[PDB]
Design a protein around this nucleic acid. Structure first.
Lengths: 57, 56
DNA sequence: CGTCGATGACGTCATCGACG
DNA sequence: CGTCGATGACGTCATCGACG
């Protein structure tokens, strides 16, 4: 029945808008975490140039 | 006139959806680039461990 | 071939801060 | 107070591939 088809679709649309919402938050969360990782790797590098300056003489 | 308000809001919705799309594309591209940088810095570190090894 | 759930695309409403 | 553009939340349509 048509009437009921649309009814189910209204629900489908609601979950769909919801997954997209989660997907976007996942993305922003990935960006935030990749940034912290960068900083860590960047500092670790200097922590290593440090050790390379000590062994330097 | 109520009619016209709705015509305009129709256009406005097209822009809005368009910008949300562009915004999501940005997030996706950022994830991609941050991953690349991540790699560079990771291997660079090992390059420096290599260089810290050469000092023994 | 008829149906299902997922999705992209779209128009509409409700609501917001800003403007005068 | 009316109005404006932007935008979040919806419901609807068209279309998909999968199923039987």
């Amino acid at each position: 029945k048509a009437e009921r088809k649309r009814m189910r679709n209204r629900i489908a649309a609601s979950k769909s808008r919801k997954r997209k919402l989660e997907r976007i938050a996942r993305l922003e969360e990935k960006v935030k975490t990749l940034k912290a990782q960068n900083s860590e790797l960047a500092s670790t590098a200097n922590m290593l140039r440090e050790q390379v300056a000590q062994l330097k003489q």
